[PDB]
């Protein structure tokens with residue numbers, strides 16, 4: 024039993040752990056992701072505890088990570104790239120939606136450059152599986168805004184360049200719970216200042232979600 028993990032985006036080999044609640048991500052190019060998890064653990068442990076899946080350990084080239092979808096009956100997942108891309112500019116200006124649950128139904132294309140209006144529409148598309156209870160969808164948005172606000176505030180004090188990192192947004196079909204966490208440290212770098220570009224990605228998301236939560 025190798026059970027392939029249903030990824031939203033990326034090209035790394037990710038499988039289910041042999042045990043419950045764990046996924047195994049192969050470090051394809053270097054062990055930098057492991058070096059960065061260990062650096063954050065030693066220098067910014069509060070950031071790791073609040074915003075990042077637990078790293079349970081390492082097996083050869085495999086990271087044993089907390090499965091962020093594990094406690095969900097019917098998870099809907101959106102992957103938003105908020106760190107700098109390797110060569111390309113962001114598809115939505117400050118960030119790039121990499122994919123989401125049911126995106127094929129909406130003709131989402133991760134290579135398409137989007138206007139603000141199309142960006143907002145794809146986020147609304149992601150929220151449609153959450154259903155007709157406007158009040159429950161508002162609560163999911165507000166809980167994301169609560170955590171992302173705190174993240175953006177905390178990023179001012181972190182001397183890392185979060186190149187390539189993604190936000191994984193999750194809500195259950197019934198909107199009974201949600202979360203957002205930072206994943207993919209494989210290109211993160213030590214620097215002597217905060218990462219303003221990544222902070223701008225997060226504040227732009229906060230603005231967009233806040234408009235959605237307030238829309239009548």
Ligand SMILES: Nc1ncnc2c1ncn2[C@@H]1O[C@H](COP(=O)(O)OP(=O)(O)OP(=O)(O)O)[C@@H](O)[C@H]1O
Nearest residue numbers: 030031032033034035076088089090091102207209
């Ligand atoms: N801890 C996690 N819990 C749940 N899903 C995760 C987790 N980490 C990754 N994912 C899933 O895997 C996808 C891609 O993961 P990630 O971005 O870490 O790897 P990647 O882009 O394939 O890797 P890399 O470019 O570093 O080789 C996400 O879109 C998401 O669906």
